[PDB]
Chain A
Amino acid sequence: TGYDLSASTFSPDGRVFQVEYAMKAVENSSTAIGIRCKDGVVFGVEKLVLSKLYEEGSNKRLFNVDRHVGMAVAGLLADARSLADIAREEASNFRSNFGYNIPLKHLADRVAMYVHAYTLYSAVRPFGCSFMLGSYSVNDGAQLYMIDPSGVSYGYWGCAIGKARQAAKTEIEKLQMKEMTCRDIVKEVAKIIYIVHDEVKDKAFELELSWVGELTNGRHEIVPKDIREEAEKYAKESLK
C-alpha cells in the first residue's frame, strides 16, 4: 500500500501488490469452466448478454489457437485478444522450424514466460486475464492447463475461472471423469453452469460449449448442440 505503485518494487514483507491487484480483476468476470474426459477436453463458458442489441455470437471467449488448441479466456476481453494472437504466432514458428504440431506442454511454457515478462518492468503492467488450454493427440492424449496473471502454469483435471471459482469446483470433483466419454460430459457441463447463478441477480445469458477430442479426430470446434439442443433440455430438468 504505497509501496504498491510499480510492478518492479517489493513490499516490506516481500510481495508485489500490482500482481495481486490484477488477480482479483479476473474475479469480477463471469464463470468459465473446463473439464477433460478420458478421450477429450470439453470447455464451457457462462456468457451474459449485455443489454439486448448483442447479435447472438459476438465477442466470444472460446478462441482457436491452433488446429487442436483453443482458449477459454475470462477477465479483460481486449487484453485476452492480444494474448491470443501471441499464441497463434508462437505455434506458427514451431511449425516452420520443426515441421509438426506444437505440444501443449511446450505451448503453455512459451505463453506463461511471455506473461511473466510483463510483471517485471515499471513501464508495463501485468495482464488482467486468466484462461484455459485444452488439446488432444494420439501420442499424448488429452491435457488441460491453467494460466494465472502471474504466470504459474500447470495441469488440472477440471477448473473454473470467474466469480464462482470455488463454487463450481465443489461439484466438479463429484464426477467420475476418469472413465466418462466426452459426449456424456457435454450434458453434464451444462448443469454446472445453470446451478450457480445464471440469471438470478443478472439479466440474461447464453451458453457456449467448445469441444475437442477423439470424436473430432483432433479438430477443435464448437459443439453441434444447436443440433437437438440437448444441453438445455437436460440441465433445466434439474430445477428440483
Chain B
Amino acid sequence: ERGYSFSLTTFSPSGKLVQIEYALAAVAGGAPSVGIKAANGVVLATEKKQKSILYDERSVHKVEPITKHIGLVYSGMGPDYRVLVHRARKLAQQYYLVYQEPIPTAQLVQRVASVMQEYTQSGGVRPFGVSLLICGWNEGRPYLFQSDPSGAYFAWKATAMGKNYVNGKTFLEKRYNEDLELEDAIHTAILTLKESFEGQMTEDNIEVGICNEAGFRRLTPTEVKDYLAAIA
C-alpha cells in the first residue's frame, strides 16, 4: 500500500475531541446492561432479544469469560466486541507465561484500556464503539471495572450501560446498599433490567453471569428460568 499514516482526530478550537464524543453516542444506543458488586460476588446481566423467532440462542453469547475468574460484557455494537475479547485472551496468557500466576483484574484493565487508547491516536483507524464491564474476584475482594472507548476506566459499585442508563442509574442508587448477598444481588439486577425490557422476559431474553470466589461462572437457562420463576 501507500503508507498514508495520518490520524483522523484533531482538537476543536474549543478544545474537545469530536470523534470520541460521537463514538459514545453509538455506545448509548446499544443493548442495555447492568453490573452489581455484592459483598461476596459480582453479578453481570444483559438484554439479549432476537429480532425474529428464527434466531438460535446457543450460538452467540454475551457474558464471556477471559480467564476462569474473569468475565466481561459490553454495551455497543456487535462485531467490534469480538476483536478486543480475542485481544484480551492473548494478553492475559502473556502474564501467565511470565509470572506463572493468573492475572489480577486491576492489571488486566491497565492493558486493555491501552489497546483502546491506541486506535484513538494512531493513523486512519477509528475509535471503538464498545464500552465494557470487567469483573472478577481476585485476592479475596471482588472487583468491577468499566472501560470506555476514550481509553479511561473507572471502578463502580453498581452501574448500567446501554439504553435508558440514566433511569437505571437512579434506580440502582435507590436500591443498592453497602452489602448484600450474591443471591440477593441477582434479584436487584433483573429488576433493574426489567425496567427497560420488553413485555416478556424468559430464560432466553436475559443472560446472566456471576463471579463467586470459586471462579467465574455463566448461568445456563435452567437456573435463569428457575430464578425468574415468580421470584420477581
Let me know if chains A and B touch directly in the complex, using CB atoms closer than 8 Å.
yes
Within the complex, the shortest CB–CB distance from B174 to chain A, in Å, comes to 47
Which B residues are in CB contact (< 8 Å) with A123? 1-2
A121 contacts partner chain B, Cβ-Cβ < 8 Å: yes
Give chain A's interface residues, CB within 8 Å of chain B. 121, 123
| Nearest 3 A/B pairs, CB to CB | A123-B2, A123-B1, A121-B1
Q: Which residues of chain A come closer than 8 Å to B2, judged between CB atoms?
A: 123
B1-16 vs A: 1/0 string, CB under 8 Å?
1100000000000000
3 contacts between A and B (CB under 8 A): A121-B1, A123-B1, A123-B2
Shortest CB–CB separation between residue B123 and chain A, in angstroms? 15
Q: Which residues of A contact B1 (CB under 8 A)?
A: 121, 123
The distance in angstroms between the C-alpha atoms of A123 and B2, with both chains bound, is 7
- Name B's interface SS: loop
Q: What is the total number of residues of chain B having a CB less than 8 Å from a CB of chain A?
A: 2
Contacts of A121 in B (CB 8 A): 1
Min C-beta distance of B124 to chain A, whole Å: 11
Distance from B8 Cβ to chain A, minimum over Cβ atoms (Å): 15
Given the complex of chains A and B, what is the CA–CA distance between A123 and B3 in angstroms?
Answer: 10
Cα–Cα, bound, A129→B191 (Å): 64
Q: How far is the CA of A123 from the CA of B4 in the complex (A)?
A: 10
Cα–Cα distance between A121 and B1 once the two chains are bound (Å): 9
The docked-state distance in angstroms from the alpha carbon of A121 to that of B3 is 12
Q: Find the A residue at minimum CB distance from B2.
A: A123
A123 to B1, CA, bound (A): 8
| Closest chain B CB from A9 CB (angstroms) | 15
In chain B, what residue has the closest Cβ to A123?
A: B2
Separation in Å of the B5 CB from the closest CB of chain A?
14
Question: How far does the alpha carbon of A121 sit from the alpha carbon of B2 in the complex, in Å?
Answer: 10
| A76–B80 CA distance with the chains assembled, in angstroms | 42
Taking the closest CB of chain A, its distance from the CB of B98, in whole angstroms, is 40
Tell me the complex Cα distance, A102–B1, Å. Answer: 30
Contact with A along B89-106 (1 / 0, CB 8 A): 000000000000000000
Name the interface residues of B1-55: CB closer than 8 Å to any CB of A: 1-2
The complex places the Cα of A121 from the Cα of B4 at a distance, in Å, of 13
Chain B nearest CB: distance from A187 CB in Å? 52
Task: A231 to B181: give the CA distance in the assembly, Å.
Answer: 96
Q: In the assembly, what is the distance between CA of A191 and CA of B1, in Å?
A: 48
Nearest B residue to A122 via CB reads B2
Name A121's closest neighbour in chain B (CB-CB): B1
Q: Smallest distance from the beta carbon of A203 to chain B beta carbons, Å?
A: 44
